[PDB]
Design a protein around this ligand. Structure first.
Ligand SMILES: Cc1cccc(C)c1OCC(=O)N[C@@H](Cc1ccccc1)[C@@H](O)C[C@H](Cc1ccccc1)NC(=O)[C@H](C(C)C)N1CCCNC1=O
Ligand SMILES: [Cl-]
Ligand SMILES: [Cl-]
Ligand SMILES: [Cl-]
Ligand code: NA
Lengths: 99, 99
């Protein structure tokens, strides 16, 4: 699709067998999802941005279907105010900014 | 242009006669810049990022160039770690996310 930016670019994603709404976020390096279970090993890390830092659990090789497009990569899980699809997965679905 | 996302979508902007680096961010509702002087009166606003909310100064009808594209609109100033071009100005310059 071609998504205009009058509203937040929210899409449905499928992760860990669950449907979630998430923000397509060119300003995010990483994909950050609210608390959920994911399989496999994980490693803690901190993410800091506007407002300060939160602690997240990093899971590797997680598949996510984003608006119908499959991608695999690292997903971090933690107390984010909004589910965020960041550049590590936007590249995989071929998303670009155009103007 | 068409900007891929393998690296951060950083561009040069011009505001108050000065060049600065900023992030094109589809996950930001508004445009927030690091501390600088802008003309006119400002209004209070808060913006929420990954770690909580910050207070910013909202200036309206500010002249700003984004990657060579002229715009006039709302710019907020505050303690952001990175200059952010958000959806208000991305929409004005015709940007869309495509995949
Ligand atoms: C939501 C909003 C409303 C009004 C105005 C603004 C600017 C708004 O956006 C605020 C905001 O922080 N939006 C984020 C996503 C957002 C929207 C709504 C709520 C919470 C978050 C995101 O897009 C941009 C922001 C930029 C950033 C800031 C400081 C340092 C580095 C980068 N990016 C990050 O925080 C990312 C996180 C998400 C992995 N990040 C931080 C670790 C280093 N690298 C990195 O990429
Ligand atoms: Cl990844
Ligand atoms: Cl590509
Ligand atoms: Cl505006
Ligand atoms: Na894993």
């Amino acid at each position: 699709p071609q998504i205009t930016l009058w509203k937040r670019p929210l899409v449905t994603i499928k992760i860990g067998g669950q449907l979630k709404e998430a923000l397509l976020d060119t300003g995010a390096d990483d994909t950050v999802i609210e608390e959920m279970s994911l399989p496999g090993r994980w490693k803690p890390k901190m993410i800091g941005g506007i407002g300060g830092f939160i602690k997240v659990r990093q899971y590797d090789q997680i598949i996510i279907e984003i608006a119908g497009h499959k991608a695999i990569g690292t997903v971090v899980v933690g107390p984010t105010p909004v589910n965020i699809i960041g550049r590590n997965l936007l590249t995989q679905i071929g998303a670009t900014l155009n103007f």
